[PDB]
Tab-separated table of C-alpha atoms and ligand atoms in Angstrom:
chain	number	residue	atom	x	y	z
A	3	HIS	CA	117.605	79.296	101.123
A	4	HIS	CA	114.499	81.172	102.159
A	5	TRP	CA	113.354	81.924	105.697
A	6	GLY	CA	111.604	79.406	107.831
A	7	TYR	CA	111.650	77.986	111.325
A	8	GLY	CA	114.779	75.684	111.433
A	9	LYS	CA	118.319	75.815	112.775
A	10	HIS	CA	119.694	77.391	109.701
A	11	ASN	CA	116.822	79.609	108.564
A	12	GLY	CA	114.665	80.207	111.673
A	13	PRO	CA	113.965	83.377	113.645
A	14	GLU	CA	117.478	84.004	114.845
A	15	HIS	CA	118.492	84.211	111.098
A	16	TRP	CA	115.862	86.540	109.855
A	17	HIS	CA	117.634	89.803	110.560
A	18	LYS	CA	120.198	89.081	107.762
A	19	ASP	CA	117.460	89.437	105.073
A	20	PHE	CA	115.098	91.676	107.107
A	21	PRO	CA	117.139	93.989	109.343
A	22	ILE	CA	113.978	95.418	110.873
A	23	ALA	CA	114.000	92.130	112.886
A	24	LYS	CA	116.061	94.084	115.428
A	25	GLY	CA	113.841	97.107	115.293
A	26	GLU	CA	112.080	99.202	117.847
A	27	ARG	CA	108.581	97.739	117.797
A	28	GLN	CA	108.931	93.991	116.984
A	29	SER	CA	106.468	91.251	117.896
A	30	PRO	CA	105.602	89.050	119.641
A	31	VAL	CA	106.391	90.065	123.222
A	32	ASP	CA	105.961	88.722	126.694
A	33	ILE	CA	102.901	90.245	128.313
A	34	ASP	CA	103.810	90.848	131.934
A	35	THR	CA	100.336	91.133	133.352
A	36	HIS	CA	101.414	92.874	136.498
A	37	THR	CA	103.127	95.805	134.670
A	38	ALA	CA	100.419	96.225	131.925
A	39	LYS	CA	98.719	99.571	132.538
A	40	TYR	CA	94.916	99.607	132.958
A	41	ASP	CA	93.543	102.283	130.738
A	42	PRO	CA	89.897	103.028	131.663
A	43	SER	CA	89.695	105.222	128.524
A	44	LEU	CA	90.047	102.064	126.286
A	45	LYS	CA	86.749	101.258	124.490
A	46	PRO	CA	85.193	97.761	124.299
A	47	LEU	CA	86.404	95.953	121.210
A	48	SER	CA	83.807	95.893	118.398
A	49	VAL	CA	84.002	92.700	116.444
A	50	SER	CA	81.412	92.613	113.701
A	51	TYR	CA	81.684	89.312	111.905
A	52	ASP	CA	77.983	88.667	110.876
A	53	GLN	CA	78.575	89.203	107.147
A	54	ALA	CA	81.942	87.442	106.858
A	55	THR	CA	82.545	85.691	103.585
A	56	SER	CA	85.333	83.053	103.713
A	57	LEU	CA	86.665	82.024	100.334
A	58	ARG	CA	89.546	79.707	100.578
A	59	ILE	CA	91.900	77.864	102.858
A	60	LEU	CA	95.559	77.815	101.920
A	61	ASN	CA	98.842	76.112	102.987
A	62	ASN	CA	101.521	78.713	102.181
A	63	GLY	CA	104.356	76.716	103.627
A	64	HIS	CA	104.445	78.740	106.852
A	65	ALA	CA	100.939	78.223	108.224
A	66	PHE	CA	97.425	77.476	107.056
A	67	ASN	CA	95.333	80.551	106.177
A	68	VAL	CA	91.595	81.063	105.938
A	69	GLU	CA	91.026	83.998	103.483
A	70	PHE	CA	87.951	86.208	103.334
A	71	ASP	CA	86.431	88.499	100.700
A	72	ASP	CA	87.654	91.927	101.914
A	73	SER	CA	86.351	93.927	98.884
A	74	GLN	CA	83.571	95.399	101.097
A	75	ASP	CA	82.985	96.276	104.823
A	76	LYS	CA	81.558	92.931	105.818
A	77	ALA	CA	83.679	91.612	108.719
A	78	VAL	CA	85.280	94.498	110.574
A	79	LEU	CA	87.116	95.327	113.770
A	80	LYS	CA	86.780	98.719	115.413
A	81	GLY	CA	86.611	100.368	118.775
A	82	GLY	CA	89.020	99.050	121.367
A	83	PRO	CA	92.234	101.110	120.851
A	84	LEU	CA	91.545	101.716	117.177
A	85	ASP	CA	90.648	104.903	115.281
A	86	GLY	CA	88.583	103.949	112.271
A	87	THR	CA	87.638	100.678	110.636
A	88	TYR	CA	89.717	97.603	109.956
A	89	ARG	CA	88.597	94.929	107.559
A	90	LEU	CA	89.154	91.173	108.111
A	91	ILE	CA	91.330	89.730	105.379
A	92	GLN	CA	92.282	86.319	106.821
A	93	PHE	CA	93.202	84.287	109.809
A	94	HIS	CA	95.865	81.766	110.589
A	95	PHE	CA	97.528	80.028	113.522
A	96	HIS	CA	100.952	79.350	114.978
A	97	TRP	CA	101.492	76.185	117.006
A	98	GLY	CA	103.915	73.803	118.656
A	99	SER	CA	105.333	70.317	118.397
A	100	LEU	CA	104.081	69.703	121.951
A	101	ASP	CA	101.141	71.208	123.900
A	102	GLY	CA	103.652	73.151	126.078
A	103	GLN	CA	104.656	75.590	123.344
A	104	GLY	CA	103.410	77.137	120.121
A	105	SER	CA	102.088	80.645	121.026
A	106	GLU	CA	104.039	83.738	119.873
A	107	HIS	CA	102.957	86.042	122.658
A	108	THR	CA	103.437	84.716	126.177
A	109	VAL	CA	101.638	85.816	129.436
A	110	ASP	CA	104.010	86.050	132.406
A	111	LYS	CA	106.361	83.799	130.372
A	112	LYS	CA	103.539	81.175	129.940
A	113	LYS	CA	103.408	79.609	126.440
A	114	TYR	CA	100.143	78.353	125.061
A	115	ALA	CA	99.737	75.457	122.651
A	116	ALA	CA	98.835	77.744	119.783
A	117	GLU	CA	97.820	81.258	118.856
A	118	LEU	CA	95.190	82.447	116.410
A	119	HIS	CA	95.701	85.657	114.454
A	120	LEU	CA	92.774	87.419	112.785
A	121	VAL	CA	94.315	89.984	110.494
A	122	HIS	CA	92.538	93.174	109.601
A	123	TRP	CA	93.669	96.220	107.531
A	124	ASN	CA	92.777	99.885	107.984
A	125	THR	CA	90.245	100.848	105.305
A	126	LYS	CA	91.799	104.389	105.232
A	127	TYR	CA	94.601	102.790	103.124
A	128	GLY	CA	92.341	101.093	100.619
A	129	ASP	CA	93.924	97.638	100.572
A	130	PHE	CA	96.156	95.315	102.509
A	131	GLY	CA	99.328	95.920	100.521
A	132	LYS	CA	99.195	99.649	101.065
A	133	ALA	CA	98.180	99.265	104.696
A	134	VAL	CA	101.300	97.229	105.642
A	135	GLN	CA	103.443	100.189	104.665
A	136	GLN	CA	101.788	102.327	107.370
A	137	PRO	CA	102.433	102.553	111.087
A	138	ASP	CA	98.698	102.016	111.808
A	139	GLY	CA	97.960	99.748	108.847
A	140	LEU	CA	96.925	96.542	110.533
A	141	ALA	CA	95.036	95.410	113.631
A	142	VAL	CA	95.754	91.776	114.515
A	143	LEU	CA	93.405	90.143	117.048
A	144	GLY	CA	95.422	87.423	118.835
A	145	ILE	CA	93.671	84.590	120.742
A	146	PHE	CA	95.505	81.933	122.688
A	147	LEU	CA	94.663	78.213	122.415
A	148	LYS	CA	94.938	75.806	125.367
A	149	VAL	CA	94.387	72.064	125.050
A	150	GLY	CA	91.236	70.844	126.887
A	151	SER	CA	87.658	70.514	125.634
A	152	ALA	CA	87.142	70.713	121.835
A	153	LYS	CA	86.208	73.985	120.125
A	154	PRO	CA	83.255	72.893	117.959
A	155	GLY	CA	83.588	76.044	115.766
A	156	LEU	CA	87.098	74.961	114.887
A	157	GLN	CA	86.208	71.566	113.526
A	158	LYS	CA	85.332	72.594	109.996
A	159	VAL	CA	88.797	73.945	109.664
A	160	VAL	CA	90.467	70.877	111.131
A	161	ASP	CA	88.543	68.512	108.874
A	162	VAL	CA	89.716	70.230	105.578
A	163	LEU	CA	93.505	70.152	106.581
A	164	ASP	CA	94.185	66.796	104.982
A	165	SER	CA	93.176	68.420	101.593
A	166	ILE	CA	95.946	71.088	101.971
A	167	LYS	CA	98.687	68.990	103.495
A	168	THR	CA	101.584	70.517	101.508
A	169	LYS	CA	103.007	73.931	100.546
A	170	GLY	CA	100.953	75.680	97.826
A	171	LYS	CA	97.743	73.674	98.293
A	172	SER	CA	94.377	75.381	98.589
A	173	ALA	CA	90.770	74.484	98.858
A	174	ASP	CA	87.514	76.262	98.535
A	175	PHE	CA	86.362	77.202	102.022
A	176	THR	CA	83.032	78.971	102.053
A	177	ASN	CA	80.495	79.798	104.757
A	178	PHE	CA	83.017	79.491	107.658
A	179	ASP	CA	81.929	81.651	110.541
A	180	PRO	CA	84.947	83.065	112.521
A	181	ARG	CA	82.621	84.041	115.506
A	182	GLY	CA	82.913	80.311	116.455
A	183	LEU	CA	86.619	80.849	117.296
A	184	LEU	CA	86.108	83.642	119.888
A	185	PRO	CA	86.158	83.189	123.645
A	186	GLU	CA	83.354	84.655	125.837
A	187	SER	CA	85.230	87.745	127.036
A	188	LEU	CA	86.737	90.473	124.776
A	189	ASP	CA	88.966	91.782	127.635
A	190	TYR	CA	92.339	92.501	125.922
A	191	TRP	CA	95.909	93.814	126.097
A	192	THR	CA	97.143	96.178	123.352
A	193	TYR	CA	100.522	97.487	122.210
A	194	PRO	CA	102.245	98.649	118.941
A	195	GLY	CA	104.205	95.953	117.159
A	196	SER	CA	104.924	94.109	113.910
A	197	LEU	CA	104.262	91.149	111.680
A	198	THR	CA	105.798	88.069	113.307
A	199	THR	CA	107.128	86.674	109.982
A	200	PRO	CA	109.204	88.328	107.338
A	201	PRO	CA	108.974	91.078	106.172
A	202	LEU	CA	108.499	91.870	109.887
A	203	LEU	CA	106.918	95.265	109.058
A	204	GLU	CA	106.136	97.531	112.004
A	205	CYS	CA	102.491	98.159	110.947
A	206	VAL	CA	100.464	96.283	113.590
A	207	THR	CA	98.256	97.422	116.465
A	208	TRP	CA	98.167	94.219	118.473
A	209	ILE	CA	95.027	93.320	120.416
A	210	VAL	CA	95.579	90.106	122.459
A	211	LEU	CA	92.517	88.630	124.290
A	212	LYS	CA	93.093	87.657	127.898
A	213	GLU	CA	90.877	84.605	127.758
A	214	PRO	CA	92.164	81.603	125.757
A	215	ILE	CA	89.944	79.263	123.850
A	216	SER	CA	90.263	75.616	124.484
A	217	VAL	CA	90.733	73.113	121.700
A	218	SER	CA	91.110	69.325	122.002
A	219	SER	CA	94.243	67.370	121.762
A	220	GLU	CA	92.851	65.769	118.625
A	221	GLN	CA	92.214	69.133	116.949
A	222	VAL	CA	95.811	70.425	117.543
A	223	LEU	CA	97.221	67.026	116.565
A	224	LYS	CA	95.682	67.521	113.214
A	225	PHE	CA	97.474	70.909	112.774
A	226	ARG	CA	100.774	69.019	113.365
A	227	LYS	CA	100.063	66.639	110.400
A	228	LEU	CA	100.582	69.516	107.934
A	229	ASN	CA	103.821	69.847	106.033
A	230	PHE	CA	106.178	72.764	105.480
A	231	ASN	CA	107.362	71.178	102.181
A	232	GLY	CA	105.591	70.918	98.816
A	233	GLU	CA	104.042	67.693	97.406
A	234	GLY	CA	106.743	65.348	96.285
A	235	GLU	CA	109.439	67.142	98.255
A	236	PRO	CA	110.648	65.379	101.474
A	237	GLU	CA	108.354	65.484	104.558
A	238	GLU	CA	108.895	68.163	107.155
A	239	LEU	CA	106.088	68.454	109.684
A	240	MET	CA	104.596	72.000	110.048
A	241	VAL	CA	105.239	72.384	113.829
A	242	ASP	CA	106.888	75.139	115.837
A	243	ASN	CA	106.069	77.887	113.345
A	244	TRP	CA	106.210	80.568	116.063
A	245	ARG	CA	108.643	83.472	116.625
A	246	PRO	CA	109.874	83.857	120.241
A	247	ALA	CA	109.190	86.905	122.346
A	248	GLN	CA	111.226	89.978	121.328
A	249	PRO	CA	112.473	92.880	123.481
A	250	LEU	CA	109.695	95.264	124.581
A	251	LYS	CA	112.091	98.299	124.185
A	252	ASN	CA	110.388	101.570	124.664
A	253	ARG	CA	106.740	100.286	124.828
A	254	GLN	CA	103.931	100.069	127.338
A	255	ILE	CA	101.316	97.289	127.175
A	256	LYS	CA	97.812	98.616	128.001
A	257	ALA	CA	94.983	96.563	129.479
A	258	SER	CA	91.286	97.083	128.876
A	259	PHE	CA	90.488	95.525	132.245
A	260	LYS	CA	91.173	95.211	135.986
B	301	R8N	C1	101.155	88.192	112.845
B	301	R8N	N1	101.130	86.889	112.129
B	301	R8N	S1	102.033	86.813	110.767
B	301	R8N	O1	103.157	87.786	110.704
B	301	R8N	O2	102.444	85.433	110.539
B	301	R8N	C2	100.957	87.211	109.406
B	301	R8N	C3	100.482	86.315	108.461
B	301	R8N	F1	100.810	84.999	108.492
B	301	R8N	C4	99.610	86.729	107.501
B	301	R8N	F2	99.213	85.704	106.595
B	301	R8N	C5	99.153	87.978	107.324
B	301	R8N	S2	97.949	88.479	106.106
B	301	R8N	C6	98.617	87.820	104.568
B	301	R8N	C7	97.758	88.525	103.519
B	301	R8N	O3	96.604	87.830	103.274
B	301	R8N	C8	99.636	88.876	108.232
B	301	R8N	F3	99.175	90.154	108.194
B	301	R8N	C9	100.386	88.460	109.262
B	301	R8N	F4	100.764	89.429	110.165
B	302	NA	NA1	90.491	65.424	107.082
B	303	NA	NA1	91.810	64.895	124.734
B	304	NA	NA1	109.200	63.136	94.638
B	305	ZN	ZN1	100.501	85.195	112.795
């Protein structure tokens, strides 16, 4: 009876195994754009993805995950609200059963069809597993997806999904360039928060871009053909693998713009 996204093991259940679910800095949150504080001391985000090395794509039963070689400073995030250097380890998405839902963060209560998370770990902690035990261990870049025109830079990912349909499948996935998933503007909101799946650790500096990318209906439809179950276990479509917004508590969301 492990955690998942259903009636009996979904987000409202998670606190029984992971009591930090009700903690002081949980994610996602609603971004109320009118109360976010402009901070003119926030630096432009530095996203340096030229040397990224993707390795593999994996269905873990919760999402699909594009993993990168993080054994050197290739693809890194710095600047913005960050002190020091954070290394890209992987990305993944959360999405809906319908185009009207699927994002984790919301903007003035608006849900997007999906949300991309590019996960990076602070190189002061030497690897990802040590970094998640620290208050400033991760920086997650979150990008919203709306359904409209196709994102051409997403298509390589979409086309390999049928090869990892079920829980525990991987595939080699080399030479994927994550710059193809970024919108034009790096204007962002930032706040202190957590992982959005168990173990829900409060180790994340969240950076959420204001500008969504658009993807086509066909591209998100293909995300919804994945399965939460393993091969030869009964079919459960991988849809609605998002956690709802959690109480902001004693936090202020900062804006890099306007
Ligand atoms: C914020 N999204 S999340 O909690 O679902 C999530 C995730 F799915 C990940 F896979 C990783 S990195 C796994 C190590 O490679 C991570 F840091 C995350 F925060
Ligand atoms: Na395919
Ligand atoms: Na369409
Ligand atoms: Na079977
Ligand atoms: Zn995520």
